[PDB]
Amino acid sequence: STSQVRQNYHQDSEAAINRQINLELYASYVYLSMSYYFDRDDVALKNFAKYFLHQSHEEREHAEKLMKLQNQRGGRIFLQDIKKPDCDDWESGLNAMECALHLEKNVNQSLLELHKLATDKNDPHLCDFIETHYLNEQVKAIKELGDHVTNLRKMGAPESGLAEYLFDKHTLG
Amino acid sequence: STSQVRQNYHQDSEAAINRQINLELYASYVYLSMSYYFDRDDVALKNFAKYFLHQSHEEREHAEKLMKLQNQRGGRIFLQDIKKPDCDDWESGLNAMECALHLEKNVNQSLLELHKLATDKNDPHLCDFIETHYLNEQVKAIKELGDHVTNLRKMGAPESGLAEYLFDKHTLG
Amino acid sequence: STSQVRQNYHQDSEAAINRQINLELYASYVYLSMSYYFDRDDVALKNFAKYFLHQSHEEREHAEKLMKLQNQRGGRIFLQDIKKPDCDDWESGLNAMECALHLEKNVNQSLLELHKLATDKNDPHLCDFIETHYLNEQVKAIKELGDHVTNLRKMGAPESGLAEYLFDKHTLG
Amino acid sequence: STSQVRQNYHQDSEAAINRQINLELYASYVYLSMSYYFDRDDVALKNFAKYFLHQSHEEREHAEKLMKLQNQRGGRIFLQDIKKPDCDDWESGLNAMECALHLEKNVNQSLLELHKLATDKNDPHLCDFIETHYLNEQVKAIKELGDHVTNLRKMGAPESGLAEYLFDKHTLG
Amino acid sequence: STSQVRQNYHQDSEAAINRQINLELYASYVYLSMSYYFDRDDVALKNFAKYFLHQSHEEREHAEKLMKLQNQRGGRIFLQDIKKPDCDDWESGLNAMECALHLEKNVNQSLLELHKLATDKNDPHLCDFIETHYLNEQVKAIKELGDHVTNLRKMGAPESGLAEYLFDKHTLG
Amino acid sequence: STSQVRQNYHQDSEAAINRQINLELYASYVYLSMSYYFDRDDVALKNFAKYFLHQSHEEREHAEKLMKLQNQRGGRIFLQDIKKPDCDDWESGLNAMECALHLEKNVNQSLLELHKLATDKNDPHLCDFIETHYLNEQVKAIKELGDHVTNLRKMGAPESGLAEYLFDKHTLG
């Protein structure tokens, strides 16, 4: 049953990769919903939609990378249902940005837990892969999301709408 | 009397094309008036004028397309008077945009009624022509006008004038 | 009420510009009707249609130039109804050419009357504008229309149809 | 027996495609005969021959397009005999043009009947295919044939031969 | 509540678009699973994986197109859970191809039902959109899948493995 | 009645050219049917279809060449009905190739009989024309068809289907 190429790959590190795979798919779905909310005519903030769409594409490519890694090491991929996003209305841009930040922090925590599991089982390849492809990019994305939120807050009230328009036109545009 | 090339063309589908022709001409006249209102020195919003002038040119070309279609199918074109626009003063930019939206919705309703008449008389060529050249563009234009109006509203009060200046400079410019 | 930029501009020279504006629009409408008559399949003279369509475009651009001049000097533009062309059938090409000539002569007379009014009120800018953009072009157009008519007459009878075909193919084509 | 890919394709819409296929082949044969009549030395009108040869090639390509459509939807093609053209002598150019016009009108009527049958059976693909590839081109061809006939008639008598030579040299050449 | 741009858009045509959206997402998920099955080392058929991955990308882009259409017409998008693929092991290449064919036929049936609903409510824009972007491509894809299956069957037994290798190397490669 | 340019052209050599013309048209029809049989989805051999389609185009051009020759020498062309192909199903590729070979041999025999008739009437132009344009190409085509058949036979049984696939992919592709 075990693949001819499998070597130094544990059952736990396979189930964890599958769960991370599902989580990345769910994140991509959430970002798709976020972007196509801001694509609506009652919102009409183009650059927000483009930003979230790019985030969704990046999450999808990361899930594909995980699946390729699973196949290379001799693991077998198991696909599960993808749960729909939390909200159907994502409110103002200040709140969407804060929901994206929380999602990114959750995914980063999951990656760190996976790294802990990998170092538990003495698997240098998995640790190297996670370090190379995931952690630093997650830190950069979280830093960028933090900057955007503080700038939105700096502008913000009293004239919230003008502020949201100018942030859309200057920063993200 | 009937043209040598006429075939599967009904009297009703000819009168309707003529009426649509007149309506398109009237729309072009209205957009010309809109643009040359904003060209005035007491308004001085250039990009609004350019936008409405482009709308007028598009309406004119659509009327010419209808006239060409009428000639190809063997119909005879009848030209009627073009009534002057409703207003001489088009108020702020928020109101001009809302008058353009209403005009576009009226023209779209007329096109849908023409399509209904065409399918009544079993004329696939007219339905194909309307579908290809008119409907989708009307939907796109109405969507674009809706986005502009919501953004203008988002900025808007308290500082309406600064908002109208920044929308002119960023979006339409 | 009077514009901040208005200076040496009289009420009469504003109403006259508006009337000339309406007359140019009516001329453009007439030329559109002329061209789309010859676009018909029972006439089928392409070059005549192209010629009249070019005339219509030129008249439209001249009306736009008048409107720009009105806006620059501080006048306010007033748009009125555009009356439909005189005829629905424009007969042979010899008669269309003679209706175009009469229309051009009428417009030239209107321009000369406007110049007389301008010199009445001691307004050098309006006289310079009319001289630069309108008079010489009107003279050239009338001369060209006269040449075409005499050539059509030279060919003409007995074989009128062959003559009209060869004039269409050689001169206007 | 039914093909694995067949779906929403009716027996009637298959027989009709086969009959249209045969009709297009017959039209191509007729146009070949027309062109190679005018290629003769007692006629010697080159441009007429080239025009009819182009018509024949277009009809052939349309028949091939129908056959490809039949194969894509899971239908089976049935080929029948191609009947020879009506005439062996196609008379003057005025009469050939009028026989081409009648053939085109017949084919257009057949296409409209096929569209009626397609909408009877609730088949959107066939209606879309007919609308996209056939109807508008048929209308354009009929309009062009009508123009040529009226110009030939305009020239025509008394000097019919000179007229036919000049139409050959100028229009079709 | 109703959007400013909504016109001639029915509740039914909105729910149907949402359901089609979910179905396209599910199809993309299934094709992703198919490709990453054949990416495994115990299968090792590269071209099959690339083919199914391309299918998944196409399905994703089609879902995005549907979502854009929903937003343009004034509808509001509702996202639901995406169910996991049917199988975890997709067997030989002959069976994967037959599961892809069935999925494509199901999606085509759903599109035809949506077209029926659209023509029920007298909505020409939706019918034109479906005809332009979806139906013909579905027919082409089903035809291509049918060809591949018959060729695989032609080779096939007795030497099934060599046949599957040569089909992978020649046709899909 | 006799053409001004006719010289050293016999009635027999005219009827024979007409019959050869009809035979070439029939051959082109047969090759069209052959190609569009292999275009079907239950056969799915592309290169066979392309090969037979090329054969059909070549036969058509040869018929046109014969018609031009007939017109140059002062003969008058007579078109007759084109009979439909023998079969509606052309079986495996081995049998289609053998039906093409027989058709080519029949046409070559007809050409040789025409040459015999031409030398009977002391007509060097016709003999030169046949020698230059037809005979050698017929020999080359028959040789090529013989090679393909022997290679198909060499592969062939036991694994006929794999053999037909590899011949399609390598030789004709």
Which chain B residues are closer than 8 Å to A164 by Cβ?
154
What are the CA-CA distances from residue F39 to residues A128, A139, C87, D77 (Å)? Answer: 53, 56, 58, 10
C59 labelled binding-site residue: yes
Interhelix angle C46-72/C11-38, nearest 10 degrees: 160
Elucidation method: cryo-EM
Question: Which of D71, D122, D128 is facing E135, going by the closest CB pair?
Answer: D128
User: SS3 sequence, F97-142?
Assistant: HHHHHHHHHHHHHHHHHHHHHHHHCCCHHHHHHHHHHHHHHHHHHH
CB contact under 8 A, D39 and F79: no
Q: Quick check: E75 and A106 in contact, CB under 8 A?
A: no
Distance CA B169, CA B172 (A): 6
CA atoms of A55 and A104, how far apart (whole Å) = 10
DSSP for B52-97, written as a single string: HHHHHHHHHHHHHHHHHHHHHTT------PBPPPS-S---SHHHHH
CA distance C124 to chain D (A): 52
- Helix intervals (H) in C73-123: 93-120
Q: Is the peptide bond before F124 cis (omega within 30 degrees of 0)?
A: no
Q: Do D154 and C164 touch (CB under 8 A)?
A: yes
DSSP annotation of A6: -
- Determine if residue C74 is left, alpha or beta; phi over 0 gives left, psi from -120 to 50 gives alpha, anything else beta: left
Rounded (10°) angle between helices D160-167 and D136-155: 140
How many other C-beta atoms are found inside a 10 Å radius of the C-beta of residue D95?
Answer: 12
Nearest CA in chain D to B129: D136
Nearest CA in chain A to E44: A71
Interface residue ranges in chain F relative to chain E, Cβ cutoff 8 Å: 41-44, 159, 161-162, 164-166, 169
Which of D147, D150, D163 comes nearest C162 by C-beta? D163
Contact partners for chain F, using 3 or more CB pairs closer than 8 A, are D, E
**Residue C76's closest chain B neighbor by CA?**
B40
CA pair distance C10, C123, nearest whole angstrom:
9
Cβ contact, residue pair A41, B143, below 8 Å: yes
Q: What are phi and psi of B82, to 5 degrees?
A: -105, 115
Strand partners of residue C82: B82
Q: Which amino acid is at B120?
A: D
**Rg for chain F, CA atoms, rounded:** 19
Contact (CB<8Å) C43/D155 = no
- What φ, ψ does residue E82 adopt, rounded to 5°? -105, 115
Bridge partners of F103?
Answer: none
Contacts of F45 (CB under 8 A, 6+ apart): F38, F93, F164, F168
- Kindly state the tokens that stand for E107: 């999606």
Q: CB distance C82–B78 less than 8 Å? A: no
**C82: three-class secondary structure by DSSP:** strand
Sequence-distant (≥ 6) Cβ neighbours of residue A67 within 8 angstroms: A21, A77, E36, E39
Nearest CB among E4, E36, E77 relative to A71 is that of: E36
**How far does C46 lie from chain B, in Å, by closest CA?**
13
E110-E111-E116-E118 Cα dihedral, nearest 10 degrees: 120
CA dist B173 to B9, B162, F45, Å? 45, 15, 57
Q: d(Cα F65, Cα A129) in Å, to the nearest integer? A: 70
Q: Is it the case that chain B and chain D have 3 or more CB pairs lying under 8 Å apart?
A: yes
Q: How far apart are CA B111 and CA B135, in angstroms?
A: 7
How far lies F130's CA from each of C30, F12, F60, in Å?
A: 65, 16, 16
Strand-pairing partners, residue F82, are D82
Map residue B6 onto helix, strand or coil: coil
Q: What is the DSSP letter of A171?
A: I
How many Å apart are CA F81 and CA F76, to the nearest integer? Answer: 17
Dist. CA A162–CA F9, nearest whole Å: 93
B-chain residues within 8 Å CB-CB of A166? 166
CB D172 within 8 A of CB D97: no
Query: Which of E5, E71, E127 has its CB closest to that of B142?
Result: E5
Query: How far apart (Å, rounded) are the C-alpha atoms in residues E94 and E45?
Result: 12
Which amino acid is present at D112?
L
Chain D residues whose CB is inside 8 A of the C44 CB are 146-147, 150-151
CB-based touch A/F (3+ pairs, under 8 A): no
Domain A2-173 is found in CATH 3.30.70.1560: no
Cis check: omega of the bond before C124, within 30 degrees of 0 = no
Q: Which residue type does C43 have?
A: V
Compute the C-alpha angle B147/E7/B60, nearest 5°: 70
Give me D165's structure tokens. 């030579």
Q: What separation, in Å, do the N-terminal and C-terminal C-alpha atoms of chain C show?
A: 53
Six-digit token pair at F88? 């509606």
Nearest to A165 among B143, B154, B158 (CB): B154
Among the listed residues E87, E73, E76, E68, the one whose alpha carbon sits nearest the alpha carbon of residue E24: E68
